[PDB]
From a paper:
The β-helix domain is separated into two parts of 26 and 19 nm, respectively, by a kink of ~101° in the overall reconstruction. To improve the low local resolution in this region by eliminating heterogeneity through the variable kink angle, we carried out signal subtraction of the shorter β-helix part and local refinement of the tip of the longer, remaining part to 4.4 Å resolution. These shapes in the cryo-EM density fit the lateral extensions at the membrane-distal tip of the β-helix in the AlphaFold model (residues K525–K836), and thus allowed rigid-body fitting of the predicted β-helical structure of the membrane-distal part (residues 290–1772) into the cryo-EM density. Although the final map-to-model FSC value was limited to 6.5 Å, likely because of the non-separability of the β-strands in the β-helix, the data together with the model allowed interpretation of several unique key features of the structure. This groove is closed by the unstructured proline-rich, and amphiphilic N-terminus (residues N195–S361), which together result in a hydrophilic surface. The triangular extensions at the matchstick region result in two pits at the tip, which are present only in [name], but not in RadD and are probably involved in receptor binding.
A pivotal pathogenic factor, the autotransporter adhesin [name], facilitates association to cancer and immune cells via the receptors Gal-GalNAc and TIGIT, respectively, leading to deactivation of immune cells. Structural analysis of the [name]-ECD by cryogenic electron microscopy (cryo-EM) in combination with AlphaFold2 structure prediction reveals a 47 nm long rod-shaped β-helix with a matchstick-like tip that interacts with the immune cell receptor TIGIT and the CRC cell receptor Gal-GalNAc at two different sites.
Residue numbers in the entry: 290 to 1772
Amino acid sequence: IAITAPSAPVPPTINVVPASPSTPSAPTINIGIQPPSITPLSITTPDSVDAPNVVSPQIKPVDFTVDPGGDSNVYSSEKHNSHQGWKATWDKTINVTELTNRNYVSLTRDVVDSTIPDDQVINVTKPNNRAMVVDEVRKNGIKVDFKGTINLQRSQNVGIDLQGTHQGSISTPLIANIYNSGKIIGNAKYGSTANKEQIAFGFNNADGSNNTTMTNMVNKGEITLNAPSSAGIQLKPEDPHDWQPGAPNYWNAAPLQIGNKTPNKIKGRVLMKADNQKDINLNGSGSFGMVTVFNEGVPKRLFAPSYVANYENLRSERTYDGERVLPGGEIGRSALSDSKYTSGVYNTGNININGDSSIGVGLLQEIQEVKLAGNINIGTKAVAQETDISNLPNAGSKTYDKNKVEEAVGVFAGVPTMPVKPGEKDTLINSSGARNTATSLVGTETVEINGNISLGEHATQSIGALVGDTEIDLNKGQLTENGVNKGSNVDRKLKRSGDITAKSNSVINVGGKKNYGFVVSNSAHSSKFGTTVDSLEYNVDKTHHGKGINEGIINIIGDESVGFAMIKGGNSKSSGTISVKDNAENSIGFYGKEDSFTNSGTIEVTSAKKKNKAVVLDGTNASNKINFTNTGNIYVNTSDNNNTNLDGNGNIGIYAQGNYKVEHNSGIVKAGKDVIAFYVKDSTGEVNINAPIELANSSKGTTIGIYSDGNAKVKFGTGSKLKIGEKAVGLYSADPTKFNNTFKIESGKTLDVELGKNSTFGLLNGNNTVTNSPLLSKYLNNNTSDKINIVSFGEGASLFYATSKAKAILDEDYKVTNGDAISTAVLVANNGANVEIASGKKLETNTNAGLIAINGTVGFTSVAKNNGTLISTRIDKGIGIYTSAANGENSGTITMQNKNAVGILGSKDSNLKNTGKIELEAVSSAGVYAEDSNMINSGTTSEIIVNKETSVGIYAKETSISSVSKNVKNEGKIEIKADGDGKSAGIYSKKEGGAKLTIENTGNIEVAQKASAGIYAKNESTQANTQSEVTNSGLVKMSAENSIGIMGEKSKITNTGTGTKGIEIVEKKSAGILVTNESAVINSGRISLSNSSISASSDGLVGISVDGSSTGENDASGEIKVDAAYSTGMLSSGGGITNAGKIALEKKESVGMYATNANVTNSGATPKGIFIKDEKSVGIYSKINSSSIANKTVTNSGTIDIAGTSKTGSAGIYSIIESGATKKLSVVNNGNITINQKKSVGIYAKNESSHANTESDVTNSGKIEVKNEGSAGVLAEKYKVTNTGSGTNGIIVSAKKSAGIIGKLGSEIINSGIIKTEIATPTVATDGVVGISLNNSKATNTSGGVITLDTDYSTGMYGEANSQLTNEGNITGTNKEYIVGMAGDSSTVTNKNIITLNGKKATGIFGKNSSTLLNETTGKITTKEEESVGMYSSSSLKATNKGTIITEKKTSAGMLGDKANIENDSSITTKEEMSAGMYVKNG
């Protein structure tokens, strides 16, 4: 009968206020690029010389004189012909015998001129004779024309001859003109006997004749000689000793005996002139056509043993009666100035030389004049060479040819010509020594030719014009050579050498094979006589004798023939052209070895043909100590200074091997154009250059003083003033494998060279044959002054030029402080070559560009490796190295100083390999730059560093040019130790094409300046986040707050990171993944930031942040790890957010999903979603402020979980609106949200003012798992709560002492759905459940929500501390006893709605603790179960009742007393059985 009631426990309150982080700002970016254009230089390619062996055949004596037998005793013109000249009638078969028998026809002392008609044929039967002799015919100008046929058969025979006369006068020399139209032939065989010394015409005499004798001969017939060593026309000076026959017998004795010598002033000085006016054909070998023999006197045949003892030969200077005749012989001086008294040699006809090793025209004694204007042909007639026909049996030596003529010579010079000078005193000498004079110059100074001298096609290494010596012995006489009198002792040799001059009228048409055009094989033997008899003085004189004076054209119609070839002799004066008439090959002009010959003339290649070389200067062949004392006139192939032609190419100035050097030390030297002075070979050749040079600007090609294939010991030294202007090149090379040792440079030998424009140190191709890379690190090496300094440049020039698979190394440091404009870059790699940058190299620059690489023919992979310190300091756009179709590699340090500087750049489908360290200490600069190519960072030593703001690291662009994917790879560490709050980035990606780009980082990236991040990409156009997507398997770390982690456009990311891999952020305000244009992420890996000391309020971070153009979402395997306090996983701004992975919360004051001005979505469910572990936090929380314009909300369709049997201090759903902000922030629940923690709240919203709460909205269309005791469903302060859950959705309150709905003062409590208590009956009394609880506030139950009570002793609404409770909603509860909905403790209660209940002894209202009730009748209670009462009073001094009670159920009562005694006066109808309104529990 003692009915009591329990008491509800006190509910908790929560105040969680998490952090308010912010979104960081992406930095601005982008830098331009400039490409350089290289200068289009020129090329030249020489080669070497094979074998210019100059074998010079020697001269041989031709002393083949016949005895002057005089008249005959059977046909004397006096006793048999009556002095009427030639007798017209004779026998056609006269058998002429030798001179001893005198069977020859003789004609002497005639007054009638006679000749021979055509019909004659005469042979010779014996040697040493004349078929017929026409002697002593002065006749003062005889003139006839011979027409008979003459034949030669034995040796020492004469075809026909007309000799001079002993009668004449000094002032009127004789004039002659003889014609000879006949045929003369000298054959090669006499049975089986050899034939030689057969002479056609000539001059010879034993006894003296008249000096004033002057004669002329005109050739008119056919001349043929087939005996080897024959003689066409012979000229001789007469003996000044004037040897005489055996007087008084004289010429009667047979053979002649020379019986006396009569030297005299006016004896032995005759004059002679010869002329060929027809065809001379020489078939014999080693012969003479027209030669001036040496005046040796006579062979010993006329020297009897009685007179061999007093054999005083012309082997000494000869003086008689006061004469001063030079040793060896002399032709007298002429003063009557006319060509008809000019005694010498001249020709107009033709000479046909075909015998092997023969002489065209020979000079053996000094004569008055030698000028030649005829046809000198050697080897132009094909003949089958045979023994004693045109060759001789070999003497164990060189074999003579059968079809070609070899060792043949044309002009032979062993002595010069000595004409009459204007001051010269003539030889017009009277008997008493009375002598005339001359007032002018007659004849040319030396050997002269004005006619065509030609070598035939059969000419093989034959000689055109030979300047040789003449080695003749001498008697016991005085000797003097370059010093004191020798007093004999040293051998006495007739040292004689001649000199030749030529004119363009004399075309030297040398032809055939390797023929020796004009070889000065002499020794320049210039000889003079002293003040006494037998006096001789010798020197190397370059004025008097033995020189080379060239003025004429030397026509090289054959191939690889040589002209002026130098074995010995010293100097010569060159002023005439030597040219190749055709496309002949390897023609060499100068084979020089000795004293400085002077080139006072041009020597070039005036033809399209090339590969023929100019001058070979090497060690002296036949004189001591390589006499290259070259300081004379050196004027070759240049554009000025005594040589104004530069035509052709392949011209050389120096060619040498072995013992050679150059010694230019005085005067002036002028270098050629498109010609190279130096080119040498082998491995031991040294060069000395110390003379200052003068240069003119280079030609269409390129000019350089020095070149070699890389194999010379060329040296530089101070003193040689060097200069360049306008498109020349300092160092030229086509073969760098050996070039490394070419130029040794010694300290202090700094060379001063100044340059114009379009120039370059290194021109290199390598000929695709670079076996060895030249270690070129010496020319401006930093160690010592063993450098070369060529600094004076204009603008538009380069340093090194690499083509054709060449290779070279930057020396050390070199700079060109002469312009940063176009065509001024350090070096260019062309045709796909490779160059190496050694470590420690310091090619600093201020110019336009550094290294440029471009591929032509591939050959070898286009790549250059950097190991040195490469820095640029150009004022604007200083680019370090560039590659096109070429791979860039570095392993050293690269920095930069000035603005807009650029490091390594690649393009055109290549890759970039980084191994070195790059630091960005400058501004407005990018280290590695790329476009339409690949790249990679190789190894952790590949270090990318930034030291200042306004600079970016990796830069790669893509386009529509190639639609194949590229890649951006990193294996090194990118630690950015920069400054400033931003303005710096590490890796940057661009695209405009239709392809896709792969970007992955496996190495490390770090940033130490604020507001900066490494990854950032351009993927703006219409595509998903998988084309320029960035995936990470590397490490993303940081060192400065306010910064950013992941940045970019349209990318998909995974956290492939374990250990020291992934993303690590330990400081403030540095978001992990901020995204633009819809980027997604896989969060399976390390997001362990370890920030804010996980318990300290010192930092604040965000895992992933999003913008309006993006929706941030996590992979289903995503593991978003809260390793920091006051941090966040999801930051949302404008765009959308959705979770598909796992989102935990391990640290304090964090949030998985935080949203600003954006909507919140969850799809991750079963078993995905949000799983909160730590406390003082909420899984998802979004807030907006007065400044927030976006009307956004929060949605739930996933799993949000936090649980705890001892954890508390948190809430399920959180969202705040700041006071005064009418922005309508709301939350909707439709997912799973477990609240199994202690004292938590499913949905929380905080208020700051009593404003109109229509903006804040709280609806629960989903489910809340209230299974943990003591917690609360939802709390709010002056906000609107709508219980929109129905059935298993919404208010699932299933815990003991737990609370469904509680509100603060003036809270808008609304019920519009299910309100179902815990189904489980309490395990102990008073352990019921409460739905509504109040504390000095107001609550509004609404009938729109159904309130269901199933826990025993549970309550629907609860109130305390003067709380005013308003009831308007439905009340339901069944299957349990008591379960009073209304329990009150010290409060004012008003009832408005009618209450219904089920269960035994169910009661609607229960009052406790001095509580009082107004007792409104409308708040009545409907009784459904038996023994149920409506009112309950317990421990209440105040009680008011003014209404009747209607009972309609059995055992049901009205008023009920509890442990008290109060009496009143009221009556209530008890019409039903046992249904009365009153009963008492106390007696």
